[PDB]
Amino acid sequence: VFSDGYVVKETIGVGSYSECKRCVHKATNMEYAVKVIDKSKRDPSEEIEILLRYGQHPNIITLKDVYDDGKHVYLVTELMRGGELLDKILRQKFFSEREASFVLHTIGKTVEYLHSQGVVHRDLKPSNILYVDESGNPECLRICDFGFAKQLRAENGLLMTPCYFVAPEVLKRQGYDEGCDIWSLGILLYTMLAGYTPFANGPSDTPEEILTRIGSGKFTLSGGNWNTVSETAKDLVSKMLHVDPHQRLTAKQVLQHPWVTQKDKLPQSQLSHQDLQLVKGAMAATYSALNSSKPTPQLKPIESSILAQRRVR
Amino acid sequence: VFSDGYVVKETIGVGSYSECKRCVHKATNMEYAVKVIDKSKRDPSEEIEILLRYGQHPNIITLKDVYDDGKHVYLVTELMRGGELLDKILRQKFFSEREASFVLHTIGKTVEYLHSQGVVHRDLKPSNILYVDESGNPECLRICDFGFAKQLRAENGLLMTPCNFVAPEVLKRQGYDEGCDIWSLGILLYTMLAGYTPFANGPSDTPEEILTRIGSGKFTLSGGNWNTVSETAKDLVSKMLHVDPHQRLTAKQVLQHPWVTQKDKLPQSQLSHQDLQLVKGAMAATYSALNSSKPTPQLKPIESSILAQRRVR
Amino acid sequence: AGPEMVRGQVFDVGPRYTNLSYIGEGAYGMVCSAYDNVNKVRVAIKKISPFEHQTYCQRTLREIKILLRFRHENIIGINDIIRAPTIEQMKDVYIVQDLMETDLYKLLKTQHLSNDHICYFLYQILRGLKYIHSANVLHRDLKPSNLLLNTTCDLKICDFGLARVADPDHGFLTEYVATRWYRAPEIMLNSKGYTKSIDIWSVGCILAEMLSNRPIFPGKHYLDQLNHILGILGSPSQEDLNCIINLKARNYLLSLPHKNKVPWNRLFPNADSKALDLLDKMLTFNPHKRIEVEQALAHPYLEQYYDPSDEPIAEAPFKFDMELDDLPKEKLKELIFEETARFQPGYRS
Amino acid sequence: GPEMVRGQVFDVGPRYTNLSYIGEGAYGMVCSAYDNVNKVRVAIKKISPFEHQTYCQRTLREIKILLRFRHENIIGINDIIRAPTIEQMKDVYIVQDLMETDLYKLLKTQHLSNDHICYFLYQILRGLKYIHSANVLHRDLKPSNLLLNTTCDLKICDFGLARVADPDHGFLTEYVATRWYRAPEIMLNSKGYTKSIDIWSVGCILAEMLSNRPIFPGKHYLDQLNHILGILGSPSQEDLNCIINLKARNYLLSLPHKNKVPWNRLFPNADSKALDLLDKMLTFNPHKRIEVEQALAHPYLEQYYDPSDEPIAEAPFKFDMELDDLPKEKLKELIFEETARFQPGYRS
């Protein structure tokens, strides 16, 4: 459908006007992921440029080729063989604050890198963080799915970083988006520590009650793992998950927190967890609740308009 | 000529079918360089993709925007206001092995990075290494002018790193080009340590003389600064400037050499140098001689061909 | 409790306005819906914070003064304005308006418009624009995102921050906007003698977009936009070229390769032919030949709604107290403070 | 010791000395060298193919075919150097007449007069007539393997991908430096290839001579095909269903309609007779594509056309057996045997 140089295999993911299939590059027998995007429904330009410029980072999914048949664009990327982050660490035999810190450190550095380049991810769900293989090495982690990511630019397109002008609401929005990225790292951190998600008890939770929990910014920090979880970890999650983005840490500030820097002096005790499918269910319900909005009403006939009425006499 | 959002200033560089001008982005009042390329004479696609993918590296010139008016392409990049590396160094009141080593280390890491990505620069002359500002800080160094650079790819365009997979002469040419990059860093290193060019004494040197010196691999490591220059530096320069690319170091090996890994403890004693224009003239003569080809003969009339002679009458 | 906060943005509009809900944002303001506890209805509130920059203060003063003066069915009104009791305390301004249900941008991303709705929306845009132009004012920034709509199909133009009093022999240069795709070619070529015709071009771009759910002349750079425009309209005729001042654009245009006109029915094969006829007249390269707002309304495409007796005009030309362009931001702040005083508690006229 | 060119050893002494770099492809490096026996400079290509079956195929195909063929417009092989024992053989050096340049390098440095374009095309087709008469497909014609002297003599080289014609029967995954001269049926993988694929390449080459630009470039086959269709227009229904499979046949059907761009709008200043022949060489449908003998008789070539001096092979070419499934170890034996005749002491 795009190249006779690849063998296309099974679907490994589905997104918004997109789907991902594992494929084998015949000449080298190397495996890749190919993400097909319907260009008539979803302009992939921004995602492509962001992957082009920043995908060379070790912990960002690398863009190896692009095909365009007119209607569809096809992104050939590195294949994540190791599955999603939580599917690994909540199942693996040993997991403690030490490993969780290494995880937040690798992902944190990568998010700091993006933000410093004027890129916000905006869809930083744990399910979009994958391992490239089965080693469990934090270095093998990759941030994926930049379908919603945005690059800051000047009035005439010039590539811009928040460091060294843009309209004022545009800047506040970049700050808000950076805060949302950090808040998603906070959700990930909470879940790694607690073994469950902070604002949902499971997939059967309603969007209404998840949102009220999120809005109040209340979450449990006692019982279960929390009894033996270090105080410096508790402090950090409370600041990442904070209600107002004002008191919410930057990526840089996360990497400076003692729980991250002093990863040596961290407990190595085993951490419990809820059943994986429940955790994934609660996670999806939480992001579903966050990104949902009441469908908008349909247009009425023209004759519903008083002005239009005056014209039909 | 490409945007009313910039004020175009003086020409600051000239290349093959290209010209570079300093420009000021009005909205932000920030200065930039814009490289105009006539694409009817020179396809800039390769250069652009390489800058897009790799220009995020701190010591590679960053590509901030691209204009295309159909006939010309305009690359908007950081302005190198610190000027060329050697112009800066040989105009300094003070210069030492320690500074020289910090220069090599920074550039070497960048070349190592490029090569590991399957990129060879192929025109790594000292004059293509600039400072972004006046500080003389090694991290302000930028490799520039990727006009000749090449990315390794598979048979169907798939982005390749050198880590079979590609046809054999293509691989040999990669290795050869990598060696040419390292040899060019060896020139730079020799010149920084000696205060003059290894294979030329000045712009008055004949191309024939420079080439036979290059082909014999002969260069002085005595007299001048060499009496007090570290032996470990002498060894490094020898191996970088070696006749056969087989016994020549890789970028990674340069960075692993004692003279680079011990850069913090190298002598700070004054290194002497010859006159700047003499040395630059000698440097240009060296590369001219290296890159010069005997112009090819013009075609003769068709009637110079024996087959054609048979076809007339 | 305390001041409600929307997306990290404090909205200090209580106690009159409560239960805030995010509804949108531009490059300069954030807009929420809120409950008016005095009038017992939900309203729209835009927060702007312009006082650190002259150009942002211009946007704020221009919008406030023009909208407070204008009265028209197809132009958003301003019902209330909130800011601090003293000028030193004033960092934010909140503009309170009728809550419209959506805008044309959002609508076009969620659905297609019927041929009839396109016609009627276009009619209302031009009806509102007729009033604006009759007040000797140029909007200068018409786009789908600032055409507000209710599902009853009522349309109101908003977003008057770039609006100026007409004056050919006399505000875009380097000012950030979220989109430039609705700007006339003469603006991109920097011809600099802009007239009411620039608004008509924007409306043209908007009509073409309603017809296809795609911008007709997108592009990252003016170079790309212009090339998209020429790629459809064709190379400008000699007569159009020497209707242009300067020379630098002329010669660039003359430097360009020839491009033929693409027939509108090839671009939009299924559009009403009368819609395409009006589109051709609005999307005219030469601004002097571009159709005018009163002629546009009288075009056969809009015949069902055309009624000059119910297409009102302003009583008089609009004027600022003085030209704003060279006023320091400190002075502009005073003018904004004074213009907003009438909505302060205890204010007397 | 042995001379070294660009890091590569060229062990061809003592007969060949004073080596100088003249070029390379994806598989070989080529130098000029002085032949101390015949007292002239020659071209020498070094290949090192023995670690892979497909590289061995290229080597054996080119050596066997070129040693057999005898034609003015086809490069000959004068000598072959390799190690005296099969276990020591890692490299093969193919020695040929030194040509001054190739069409690729030429088009980078100058324009061609309308008359030279005509004569160069004539020679391409004259050589190709011989190849096709031998029942052989070159399969990889491109500017870089059309060798030229400044006397305007042209010679086809680079026969590593050449095969004996057999429609009802080696591109897949094989690295080449450029795919821009490949026929559409190759890109659509119609897999019933005939002599007509070579005619397509020549048409692409003729267009490039007329404009100093490749007519159908592209990173991917998708791109190349869209460039082709964007010029020739969407294939007719008659042409469309002249194709096996459906997977290919369905895709062009899915594609939106494109009109034919007249050749004089693409090349407004080209000789009209050149464009008429170009049209016939660059037809989408392989069955309707002009054949080499017909091409030679086309009015554009009238000044050079002479069937009495356009010789053909005496007989179809045949390898000893089909090469495709032969392990690289066997292919090496065959390359050793084919090159034995050039060894010192050899008797036949």
Ligand SMILES: Nc1ncnc2c1ncn2[C@@H]1O[C@H](COP(=O)(O)OP(=O)(O)NP(=O)(O)O)[C@@H](O)[C@H]1O
């Ligand atoms: N009265 C309203 N009712 C409903 N939505 C509104 C209302 N006013 C504005 N909006 C929405 O909020 C968005 C921004 O308003 P706008 O007045 O354009 O902001 P601005 O940032 O000052 N200028 P701009 O950058 O041109 O959008 C609009 O595009 C609408 O979606």
Ligand SMILES: Nc1ncnc2c1ncn2[C@@H]1O[C@H](COP(=O)(O)OP(=O)(O)NP(=O)(O)O)[C@@H](O)[C@H]1O
């Ligand atoms: N006999 C010759 N005389 C002069 N130049 C030659 C000669 N043979 C080859 N060349 C040049 O060397 C280049 C490579 O030759 P070639 O035989 O095509 O190499 P290959 O790598 O085995 N195949 P390819 O990848 O298709 O180029 C040519 O394109 C010519 O420029």
Ligand code: NA
């Ligand atoms: Na004004």
Ligand code: NA
């Ligand atoms: Na064969």
